[PDB]
């Protein structure tokens, strides 16, 4: 499923992300924009052989199991498959663990390079929330 911008902001807010660990809602929508272009079925292969899944491009090296990343962990206790579904619950619950890991949203390289320090409120401009 490819979400609309305000449609994703609402789903995110309903799942408890707005100001989660101090990161306002625009930060989370900006990061999803650059990671997946709002497509829950996004995947991408990394040079190390691990894969990124879903709306926030969560990595199989630490966070989910895909049965093909030698030496990896499954810290969110889920199949990477769960991260591709129309229902974002699994991606949001796993994002919560990641952002709580010590580095904040710097865990998402695209957030640090493309969203951090910018006018992120813009991404929730005009939405009924």
């Amino acid at each position: 499923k490819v979400f609309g911008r305000c449609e994703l902001a609402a789903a995110m807010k309903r799942h408890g992300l707005d100001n989660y660990r101090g990161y306002s809602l625009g930060n989370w929508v900006c990061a999803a924009k650059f990671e997946s272009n709002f497509n829950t079925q996004a995947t991408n292969r990394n040079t190390d052989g691990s894969t990124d899944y879903g709306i926030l491009q969560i990595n199989s090296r630490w966070w989910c199991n895909d049965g093909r990343t030698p030496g990896s962990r499954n810290l969110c206790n889920i199949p990477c498959s769960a991260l591709l579904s129309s229902d974002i619950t699994a991606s949001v619950n796993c994002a919560k663990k990641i952002v709580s890991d010590g580095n904040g949203m710097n865990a998402w390289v695209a957030w640090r390079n493309r969203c951090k320090g910018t006018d992120v409120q813009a991404w929730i401009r005009g939405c009924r929330l």
Side-chain angles (χ1 to χ4, degrees):
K1 174 182 182 177
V2 182
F3 280 77
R5 167 183 67 89
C6 298
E7 178 193 23
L8 191 62
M12 279 182 159
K13 174 174 191 182
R14 196 186 39 114
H15 291 262
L17 278 185
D18 188 9
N19 216 59
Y20 196 86
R21 291 273 303 209
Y23 288 90
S24 58
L25 193 62
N27 281 286
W28 296 100
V29 168
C30 182
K33 172 70 169 184
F34 296 123
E35 295 293 357
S36 64
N37 203 22
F38 308 143
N39 185 356
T40 67
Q41 296 199 83
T43 67
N44 283 271
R45 197 87 186 252
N46 302 297
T47 46
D48 65 24
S50 55
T51 303
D52 299 337
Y53 298 83
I55 218 60
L56 289 164
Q57 288 295 276
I58 292 164
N59 191 320
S60 62
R61 173 135 317 276
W62 297 40
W63 309 104
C64 62
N65 178 57
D66 58 16
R68 61 158 209 194
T69 313
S72 68
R73 299 298 299 269
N74 180 10
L75 305 178
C76 297
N77 198 37
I78 36 153
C80 296
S81 271
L83 296 175
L84 299 186
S85 82
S86 313
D87 181 339
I88 64 171
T89 306
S91 283
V92 167
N93 294 348
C94 191
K96 284 173 171 174
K97 196 170 185 171
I98 301 170
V99 75
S100 296
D101 203 53
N103 285 345
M105 284 197 75
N106 301 283
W108 287 273
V109 172
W111 177 86
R112 184 198 355 246
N113 290 334
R114 304 174 83 170
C115 302
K116 176 183 203 192
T118 73
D119 182 31
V120 297
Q121 195 277 326
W123 293 96
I124 62 156
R125 82 196 104 114
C127 306
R128 280 211 54 99
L129 303 159

